[PDB]
Design a protein around this ligand. Structure first.
Ligand SMILES: O=c1c2cc(-c3ccnc4ccccc34)ccc2ncn1-c1ccc(N2CCOCC2)cc1
Ligand SMILES: O=c1c2cc(-c3ccnc4ccccc34)ccc2ncn1-c1ccc(N2CCOCC2)cc1
Lengths: 296, 296
């Protein structure tokens, strides 16, 4: 089917490869073409899409995964639904948010992440899945104002039936800017599936921060900024992050104007419960989901 | 609701209190009257029945918990379904088993234990529950040849809605005869919920041993004996058990004649995989259920 996709324009590009707006069967599609060095991620994401029943409103839906030759060389493609509003990263720089829009975004993400983390038994079930590269560029905004989570190339899996933690075999590591302290300082218990969920929760708190900044209260709003924008450069090194997060113990600042708004007050408390040093102390995805469902 | 029951005969009495066949609305019921020293166990088990949807064919069904004044003293009652075949401890002493009835017993136990251990979500859900006092006296035999698990007095609970382990406040500790190595040597990670499930699997392996001895093969069967009958006395001390299980690494002996019967050969393997010194190496309850489902 890759043969029948017309590529229209590149809408994203990095070390991972490229993403194109494509045309297939009269519809827009997104086509990720992986770079020659990220093949293990293609393989992992193709694995999940072909073996795990993983359909959910807030998880990017796959159309197909192909191996195609483009002028005497094999490319690995992932074809998915196309979301014209773009990633959450771009969207937040192009608009501000009201309370309703802000809460739909962060609840839809929590709902997606809770569905990954929870094992489902029986016929149409799935193992537990930790994401491990959660960030605002890996979240797409839908026209209905909810989001969906993309990029399963680092997923780890677990099934209670087995002692079996399925970590794959991918040299890729998570985005440094969003790595939790226990990943930066290499004390993460790599044999414990729960450790990976607590890493997703750390990174979720950062996304929550990023989105809350863009909700208007009392007529004012903060500029879009990425986590730790003030203390690390662009493309921060491993050591930059370790210094800020581990040695200096820093966390994103809460703007004072948030305390004059009850929603932002509740989101401030929530995000700080994603950031405890002790990974065991952090909220679960399901607790976040429930809490955001009650926030008004 | 304790006034609506008439106690007819005491069918058991020990350190824990007493159990009575009572009469209620045309049916037998079991009435456990707790001893004064075991008040916290009544409280825990009343806490569970009041806060947890716990219904399963292989878990002793509760009718009510009540406080009542008899003899000018307060008795704490737990009123359950009654099983005239008695506990597994009684039944194994009354009779021998054929292959079908042996597998029906130990499968149904695995099935109840798996159900305790697994967390269920939604409106029909429940937290994960570890039992902590599993033994043949805490398992009742039903007329249909299946069993149900009793005695949640030491239960510990866990759910994906909170990273806090819900332990009791109960000084009571499990039956020493069945305690796992990591309990006896006090190396159990008291903060990790998984380690309490692993304690149940140790004990389940011991129950499996007791049941297996009573399955006849090629006209051979063993007398009923409790685990470790040959190396500790009745009512063994904590040291008695630690010397056998930890210091000497002893394990219940496998009768040679089991290796002449394919079923008992499969049961011997399954026991072994319950008895590893390393708790994390042990099978899960769900994998035991699945294995016993496929053993013929
Ligand atoms: O980039 C995408 C996109 C990417 C994936 C995708 C597929 C496979 N793997 C991924 C891993 C990480 C993140 C995304 C994917 C799936 C669907 C997608 N729909 C849309 N756009 C996208 C479309 C437009 C835009 N502009 C930029 C800012 O606003 C206006 C237009 C920016 C992004
Ligand atoms: O003891 C029971 C029994 C106990 C519970 C029960 C309720 C609440 N908590 C518990 C905690 C641990 C164990 C059991 C319970 C529930 C149902 C029960 N049905 C039957 N008998 C029982 C009845 C008779 C006998 N003999 C065996 C020897 O030949 C004479 C009869 C032995 C046991």
């Amino acid at each position: 089917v890759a043969r029948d996709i017309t590529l229209l324009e590149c809408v994203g590009k990095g070390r991972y490869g490229e993403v194109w707006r494509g045309s297939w069967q009269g519809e827009n599609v997104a086509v990720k073409i992986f770079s020659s060095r990220d093949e293990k991620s293609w393989f992992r994401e193709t694995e999940l899409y072909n073996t795990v029943m993983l359909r959910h409103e807030n998880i990017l839906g796959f159309i197909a995964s192909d191996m195609t030759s483009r002028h005497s060389s094999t490319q690995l493609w992932l074809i998915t639904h196309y979301h014209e509003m773009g990633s959450l990263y771009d969207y937040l720089q192009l608009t501000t948010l009201d309370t309703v829009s802000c809460l739909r975004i962060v609840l839809s993400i929590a709902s997606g992440l809770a569905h990954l983390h929870i094992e489902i038994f029986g016929t149409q079930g799935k193992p537990a899945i930790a994401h491990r590269d959660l960030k605002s560029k890996n979240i797409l905004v839908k026209k209905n104002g909810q989001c969906c989570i993309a990029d399963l190339g680092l997923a780890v899996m677990h099934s209670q039936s087995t002692n079996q933690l399925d970590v794959g075999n991918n040299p890729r590591v998570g985005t440094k800017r969003y790595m939790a302290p226990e990943v930066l300082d290499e004390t993460i218990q790599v044999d414990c599936f729960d450790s990976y969920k607590r890493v997703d929760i750390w990174a979720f708190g950062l996304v929550l921060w990023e989105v809350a900044r863009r909700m208007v209260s009392n007529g004012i709003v903060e500029d879009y900024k990425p986590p730790f924008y003030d203390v690390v450069p662009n493309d921060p090194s491993f050591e930059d992050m370790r210094k800020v997060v581990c040695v200096d113990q820093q966390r994103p600042n809460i703007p004072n104007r948030w305390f004059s708004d009850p929603t932002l007050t509740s989101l401030a408390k929530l995000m700080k419960e994603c950031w405890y040093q002790n990974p065991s102390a952090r909220l679960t995805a399901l607790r976040i989901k429930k809490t955001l469902t009650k926030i008004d």
